Design a protein around this ligand. Structure first.
Ligand SMILES: Cc1cc(CCCCCOc2ccc(C3=NCCO3)cc2)on1
Ligand SMILES: Cc1cc(CCCCCOc2ccc(C3=NCCO3)cc2)on1
Lengths: 255, 236, 273, 40, 273, 59, 40, 57, 59, 40
């Protein structure tokens, strides 16, 4: 009586149940694991807070309306302030982590709409100015708020044009990245497990984000007659196999 | 001193030849490799992942909406969409498949075309997808369409339908840039019965459509893509 | 290898063509799941789509130019193209660039070919064979200032001398600092509020510098250098969506404003053929 | 025959002949069998 | 091997020299069936009549020309021969053509040799060594528009750079779409009422494009390109009647009107020697 | 570096010589051969088929 | 010795030494013996 | 080859970090004598610092 | 005479290449080596000897 | 393969792979053990 459909994920002191899942994606078919010695470089023993950092943090909720263009969060940024995960983050020189991402959106059998939930490794954004204008730090570190693709261009911020993925590629091809759809008629959640993907064994958690999670409405939300025209979307994310190394004074970052 | 003779071609530089060269950095030790998920070995590995087709090309500036094929409730007998199968041009051209095919001169193989339905769960519909092999015109009505490769799709719990365009061909390779002799057919879709919405519901519903290549597929003779060009060198 | 097996009529409870794309998978459906097929063999291996093959041919990555002329009274050799350099990079010319950016991280050895041809714009006499010197100047090395500085001694820095009209060729191991080169980098060099964003911060590979060894003749001679790059021993990870809009800058993803629709509009209906 | 001492100086590599699209085409956590229902 | 066996007088009921040609056979009659012969050996193998040998020597297949000159103010490089191309084909020059069309389908690898020589028509000075770039542009590739377009980057398209006066040589596998190249094709590309008829529709092999890499000197330089083609690994099927009338077009069988009698008229009688 | 000497004829192009060359299309896979009746191997095979002689050349 | 990797790059092929004119000189359905009458 | 071995807390009478430089020696002290380390390998031979290489171009 | 083809790079001088050359002094016999204390093999050997740092740079 | 007769004409030597800093880092007459007191 197991269905692909019902699932439970327990991680730390927190549990999620979905009764309307559509399997789960594990990026590149690899599950998060700690850093092996053969791959290690820094000689420091690392710190593995385990259950105090590897639990589920639910970010603040978004509201899908008929005019929504899509939202974008960066990792580990989105979690920069969650509990002890965040403290560890500002206090060590280097850290590394994988995540379980669970995006939630329920409706009824009269609604229609379909969101794309995708994880993009190394999502370098484009400046809407063109040329070689850079995208300032603050703009690519929105924190739990994430970036709202239907917000206005700002100065020093990225471009927010959806048919171009914020980088000069077409929305249609985002499907080459680990992703899952939430089609109100099928699905009510999306779950993706992200292994740590980098060109170095461990890195800085503040100067470099290693994935952007993106939720994009593709088939517009259509509510039943005289229904309220909107649904909330909630994102809950859990660091998994986290390791921190090179402890010290506590980083100070712009803004 | 051993006697030699040099042949025609001596001193030429062929950008495609593969020979040994002296290393400028004798004895240098590269950084160790660490493990990174995701290694690609063949472009054939990636063109099997499906991506969305902007089938609804009828707009005037690129929009999220050209990915949406609309469906109308209560129409009978009528046609949902049509396209030829020049995978290197037209709707296909910006898709990952289209985009890679363009790095090669010839392609052969089967294509997989699927449609995912997004209408309310309490609605229902039966569509027919038809592949018309080279030699006939794009079908003009379902009767015409239904006499070639087709699948009656019944919209249900299972949200997507995967149609295969089996390789139908005299010549074993076709050109990726559209060519007549080498042309592959048409793909059309019609109401088999009709879309029906539940009460309290209204308007258009949309289908999303994807394209990817079957394991069947072959691409050969690499060349340059018409999809990118430039007028002055870029700088930092 | 069979490309298609033989398959006949089906009337089952087992439907391989109905799936749920919401899952993120592309189910491996074949012609034989939905029509009746006959056996056929592949006759093909997929040899020429190997990434080593795809990135393994020489591509032009840079065209520069230097001139041989009397430097007498020139206050800025660099500025007179008495010698010139190049801030090594592989993203400046954009044909090879789109190919590499199909991947996120890439690792390979490089084979460089350098073709140098001469031009004599101002009506001339006898051209004495010019010899070009290409020398690699890595980060933190005395950058050269005149066309005949102590720098050109290049006692510790690899340099090649070849003749204009000829070609020079040599191969440099993968010089990246990490395990792979980042084709993309969503980071900064540090957490400052105004520091540049991108890879440009990451691919600090130093520059390459060219000059003519010859002193000047009575006329002036323009020498134009073309650098070709061939990847050998390629390794690529994490495929990405191909580049759709035009490029504007080395190292940023930025596209131009008021660009044009990249998807071709139908001449007709959705229903059109 | 390599005439040179360093590995960078050797010619192009030889075909992976690796090829495994499943990391890209089927990264699902619970295995899907073709023919069995997608969602149970 | 015996070329003739010894044979003596015959008075038989078994007549090998009477046959019925209406049958379509050529009965294998020998000298020894009708005169008295002596033994003799062949001393010969028929080596130099092998089709590999017959089609295996280089033949000139194309002569084109490009010039190096100041492109300043040229509105159409292609038109100034600032670079030129060639719509690859093997039927344009007609010596090699008659040889190939002795067969209906032919399959082979090609070895190309390209000789480039320079000419300076307008009284001149010092000629700086020009380097030609030949690049293959297959069907559906950005055709080049100026002599120094992004196209020439040729990051994915094989190109060779050699010096004028020298020769370039490389070999291309059999690139046909079918199992053999059709020397003839009695068909159309589709059943339209006005579409071209012949092979031209079939041998869509794209074109080859040449240019000089050098910028301009004070004088002008004419470079004339000659492409030679040698078939290697030849396979030929279905022999046909040799070409009798002159050729008029690449790819059609058409002969000129009011052509001249191709059979030499006797100077004398049927009875004449 | 192995010492060599080049002989007279170096650099010449003889249309009849038979040597190896680099392939411009590294790794390309040609179309499979299928069977076709009629293969010719030697011109000596075909000159044994008889054909008509315009003997009456007097026109 | 081939110095190159691809087959197209090898020299000319070597003599068929096949030679069988009968597909061209005697494509008759019922075999004709020299010396026996052509038409019986 | 290990570049660093794994080493944990220490509370000893054996102090490798106190020396007398007046002796003229450079005592071979390592990270693992004064912090807690994890194993890591060298992955490197020191090829390009050989004097033959240094004076050989 | 063995057929050859020369590749791109022929005739170049790369200051970092390592090949054989004819000896200008054929048959000459170098002075014997005697023992000398102090041989260095790697620069890695010497950067492990400590030296003083002008830390007080303020002059 | 050496093509030449004299030893000077051969290419560069090959890595010492000798490496022993103690003549430079620990030339002390009485051996010092790390961890034992420097001056007893
Ligand atoms: C990504 C990415 C990859 C690359 C290429 C890096 C190549 C390493 C440095 O390149 C050179 C170039 C020239 C020479 C040289 N030595 C003597 C003459 O030229 C040495 C290294 O650049 N960006
Ligand atoms: C019949 C028949 C047979 C042929 C010849 C076909 C040859 C294939 C394409 O030819 C070329 C030519 C040039 C190059 C080339 N690459 C780099 C420089 O020139 C490649 C393929 O043409 N018609």
């Amino acid at each position: 009586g197991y269905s692909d459909r019902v699932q439970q994920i327990t991680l730390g002191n927190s549990t999620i149940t979905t009764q309307e899942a559509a399997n789960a994606v594990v990026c590149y078919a690899e599950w998060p694991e700690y850093l092996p010695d053969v791959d290690a470089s820094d000689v420091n023993k690392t710190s593995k807070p385990d259950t105090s950092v590897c639990r589920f943090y639910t970010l603040d909720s978004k509201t899908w309306t008929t005019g929504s263009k899509g939202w974008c969060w960066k990792l580990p940024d989105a979690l920069k302030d969650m509990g002890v995960f965040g403290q560890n983050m500002f206090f060590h020189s280097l850290g590394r982590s994988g995540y379980t991402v669970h995006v939630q959106c329920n409706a009824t059998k009269f609604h229609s709409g379909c969101l794309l939930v995708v994880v993009i490794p190394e999502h370098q954004l484009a400046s809407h100015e063109g040329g070689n204008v850079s995208v300032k730090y603050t703009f690519t570190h929105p924190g739990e708020r994430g970036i709202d693709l239907s917000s206005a261009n700002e100065v020093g911020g990225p471009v927010k044009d959806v048919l171009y993925n914020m980088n000069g590629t077409l929305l249609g091809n985002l499907l080459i990245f680990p992703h899952q759809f939430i089609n109100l008629r099928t699905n009510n959640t999306a779950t993706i497990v992200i292994p740590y993907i980098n060109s170095v064994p461990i890195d800085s958690m503040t100067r470099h984000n290693n994935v952007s999670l993106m939720v994009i409405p593709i088939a517009p939300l259509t509510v039943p007659t005289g229904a309220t025209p909107s649904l909330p979307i909630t994102v809950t994310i859990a660091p998994m196999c986290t390791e921190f190394s090179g402890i010290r004074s506590k980083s100070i970052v712009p803004q | 001193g051993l006697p030699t003779t040099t042949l025609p071609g001596s001193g030429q530089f062929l950008t495609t030849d593969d020979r040994q060269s002296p290393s400028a950095l004798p004895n240098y030790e590269p950084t160790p490799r660490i493990h990174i998920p995701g290694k690609v070995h063949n472009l054939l590995e990636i063109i099997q992942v499906d991506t969305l087709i902007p089938m609804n090309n009828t707009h005037t500036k690129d929009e999220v909406n050209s990915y949406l094929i609309p469906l109308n409730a209560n129409r009978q007998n009528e046609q949902v969409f049509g396209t030829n199968l020049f995978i290197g041009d037209g709707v296909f051209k910006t898709t990952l498949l289209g985009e890679i095919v363009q790095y090669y001169t010839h392609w052969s193989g089967s294509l997989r075309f699927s449609l995912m339905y997004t209408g309310p769960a309490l609605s229902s519909a039966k569509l027919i997808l038809a592949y018309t092999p080279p030699g006939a015109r794009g079908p003009q009505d379902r009767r015409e369409a239904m006499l070639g490769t087709h699948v009656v799709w019944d919209i249900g719990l299972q949200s997507t339908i995967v149609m295969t365009i089996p390789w139908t061909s005299g010549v074993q390779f076709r050109y990726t840039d559209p060519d007549t002799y080498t042309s592959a057919g048409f793909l059309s879709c019609w109401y088999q019965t009709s879309l029906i919405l539940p009460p309290e519901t209204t308007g258009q519903v949309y289908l999303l459509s994807f394209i990817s290549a079957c394991p069947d597929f072959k691409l050969r003779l690499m060349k340059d893509t018409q999809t990118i060009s430039q007028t002055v060198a870029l700088t930092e | 290898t069979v490309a298609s097996i033989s398959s006949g009529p089906k009337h089952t409870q087992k439907v391989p063509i109905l799936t749920a794309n919401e899952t993120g998978a592309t189910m491996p459906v074949l012609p034989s799941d939905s029509i009746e097929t006959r056996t056929t063999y592949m006759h093909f291996n997929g040899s020429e789509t190997d990434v080593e093959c795809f990135l393994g041919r020489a591509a032009c990555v840079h065209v520069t130019e230097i001139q041989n002329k009397d430097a007498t009274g020139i206050d800025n050799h660099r500025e007179a193209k008495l010698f010139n350099d190049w801030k090594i990079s592989l993203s400046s010319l954009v044909q090879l660039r789109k190919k590499l950016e199909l991947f996120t991280y890439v690792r390979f050895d490089s084979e460089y070919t350098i073709l140098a041809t001469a031009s004599q714009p101002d009506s001339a006499n006898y051209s004495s064979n010019l010899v070009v010197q290409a020398m690699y100047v890595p980060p933190g090395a005395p950058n050269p200032k005149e066309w005949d500085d102590y720098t050109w001694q290049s006692a510790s820095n690899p340099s090649v001398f070849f003749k204009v009209g000829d070609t020079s060729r040599f191969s440099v191991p993968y010089v990246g600092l990490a395990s792979a080169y980042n084709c993309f980098y969503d980071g900064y060099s540090h957490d400052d509020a105004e520091t540049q964003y991108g890879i440009t911060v990451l691919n600090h590979m130093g520059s390459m510098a060219f000059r003519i060894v010859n002193e000047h003749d009575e006329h002036k001679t323009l020498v134009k250098i073309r650098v070709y790059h061939r990847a050998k021993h390629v390794e690529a990870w994490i495929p990405r969506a191909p580049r759709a809009l035009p490029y504007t800058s080395i190292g940023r993803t930025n596209y131009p404003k008021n660009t044009e629709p990249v998807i071709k509009k139908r001449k007709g209906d959705i229903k059109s053929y | 025959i390599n005439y040179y001492k360093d590995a960078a100086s050797t010619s192009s590599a030889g075909q992976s002949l690796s090829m495994d699209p499943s990391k890209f085409t089927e990264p699902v956590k619970d295995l899907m069998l073709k023919g069995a229902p997608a969602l149970n």
